[PDB]
Subunit: 191 residues, 3 copies
């Protein structure tokens, strides 16, 4: 009976790093989590079917386009749970033109059946500051207000995921320099 | 079924207007939706049963089966949608005296399944102020701390709806004097 | 219809005394709702098994063991509600090292089928003093910010519950020295 952890965040919050750096310290101790990336789940199956041209042209497609390739990673990742403790790096909601789209709607929530959901946070100002220094990608650097509104809906969604699955919801805080503090807490929650 | 859109917001925030005005402009575009005030769609159930008269003793009505009424109206709109894209002017939660009442309960929610939920928001001060100008209704005059509260719990409903039904949650701001901007927001989300 | 009322408030807020007082008055005027305390109930399930020596340290167990016990207690009360209306005393979310474990997952909400979910609230300054002036316990005395984060997620928990069960979500304030505003406002919705 293995453990599925969901690590959610707004872009540029550092969900991924904190996760990766968390499993590495764990690997050496005994606990070999997976590093699935729920977004890339659907991008191994996307250029493969001609909907994007990279990993930043997927949330500029229509609602009916993404919501097919979702319920598929849903059990495809669930499969991987019949092998090892998973850590599904995903998004509580998704910023799109149509509005906040749930990153794990009920049908994906049953398929995955999480034991813990985690909402990595920080200020919009710090998030924004981080979005700029990351040469590795393109960030909206939108206003603080939109960050907070997102981070607000991310909580109400995270909590519903906990209601529906019984998953406990952890809120990790991740400050500049203090990223070590987010790992270790993601660790006490992972162990 | 088809494309179904639910448009919500506390009394006074002007969600009804934003909806009519959009579908006025939409009707001249050769695409045709459907105004439906969930409120009166369920008034037809009222007198046909003689349970209360007013459209007031229905959030103030005997709480057994306020839900009965609520239930039926929600699947009546159901078929109203296979036929045409629908737009449902309603509320996320209804501030009855037993607390907030979820406009779209689990059942009605499934019995409808919108592809979009829309949350219309503005300051308590302005909401309050529009209520003074709504002479069309026998309005109440509540505090702002409590308007803000209700808009809180609304967003939460609204997001629990999204998850349960894969629908996108859009928060559309509708400030004083700027009716048309929210109209443009509603619309480009309907397309 | 037999009436299941749920009442929640972070530890320290006064959910218990609120419901206590609310019933004396009700019991000395006809309806004694059954006074039932979710944690008292499930403690009795744990001590008997040895998993807990004190009621206090059950939330420091593992989530999954907490959910087990929790589920047994949810169905102990379910049979309690076949034969008398029950104001059940519980929590929107429990605070654990692994985050906010819900207080009524979907399967538990199904069990009780509450009609009203009530949230008791107040400032985290006021609560922190209630926690110090309470001999009957051994409180851990946490940060203000951590109380509002819990009281936040509580609201989204308790809102989730409304959308699933169709219960009404009543929010109720218990300030210092004003213990009897809560009692009376509870009854007013309790009867
Ligand atoms: N389940 C779902 N359903 C439907 N669609 C889904 C979905 N899940 C994903 N998608 C789709 O997938 C696409 C991809 O998502 P998108 O958000 O665009 O990229 P991502 O794969 O999800 O990664 P992030 O954007 O979240 O970057 P990150 O900050 O979280 O991680 P990291 O810390 O390593 O990023 C680098 C950051 O590290 C942080 N960092 C690095 N060094 C430091 C430091 N020294 N101090 C503090 N922070 C640091 C910085 O903030 C830096 O920016 C989206 O279009 C989305 O629509
Ligand atoms: N889901 C469901 N379940 C259970 N019950 C349900 C239900 N759905 C509905 N009901 C029931 O239906 C009943 C009421 O019907 P319903 O119409 O659904 O709710 P309501 O309380 O009566 O809503 P209002 O008409 O008062 O507010 P509004 O913002 O929609 O009105 P308007 O667009 O005119 O805006 C207000 C005024 O401000 C003006 N205004 C001024 N400036 C602006 C501007 N800047 N933008 C927009 N409007 C402006 C507008 O012109 C207008 O005059 C309730 O009892 C409720 O129980
Ligand atoms: N659904 C679920 N799922 C999984 N686990 C669950 C669960 N539900 C419960 N649990 C578990 O069960 C346990 C729950 O224990 P629980 O039953 O919840 O604790 P308790 O013994 O009742 O006391 P609390 O710590 O809960 O404080 P309270 O404020 O709620 O009650 P009170 O008003 O009397 O506090 C009284 C004190 O506050 C003060 N006070 C009250 N009102 C006022 C007033 N207005 N002015 C001044 N002081 C006041 C007085 O000083 C008094 O001393 C947890 O460990 C958890 O594991």
């Amino acid at each position: 009976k293995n453990k599925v952890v969901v690590v959610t965040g707004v872009p540029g919050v550092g969900g991924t790093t904190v996760t990766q750096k968390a499993m590495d310290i764990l690997s050496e101790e005994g606990l070999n989590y997976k590093m699935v990336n729920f977004g890339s789940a659907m991008f191994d199956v996307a250029n493969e079917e001609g909907l994007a041209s990279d990993r930043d042209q997927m949330r500029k497609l229509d609602p009916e386009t993404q919501k097919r390739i979702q319920k598929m990673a849903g059990r495809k990742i669930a499969e991987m749970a019949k092998e090892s403790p998973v850590a599904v790096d995903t998004h509580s909601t998704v910023k799109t033109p149509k509005g906040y789209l749930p990153g794990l709607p009920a049908w994906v929530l049953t398929e995955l059946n999480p034991d813990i959901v985690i909402v990595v946070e920080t200020d919009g100002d710090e998030i924004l500051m981080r979005r700029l220094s990351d040469e590795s990608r393109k960030r909206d650097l939108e206003t603080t207000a939109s960050i907070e509104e997102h981070q607000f809906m991310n909580r109400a969604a995270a909590m519903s995921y906990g209601v529906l699955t019984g998953a406990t919801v952890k809120i990790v805080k991740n400050k500049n320099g203090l990223v070590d503090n987010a790992v270790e807490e993601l660790m006490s929650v992972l162990r």
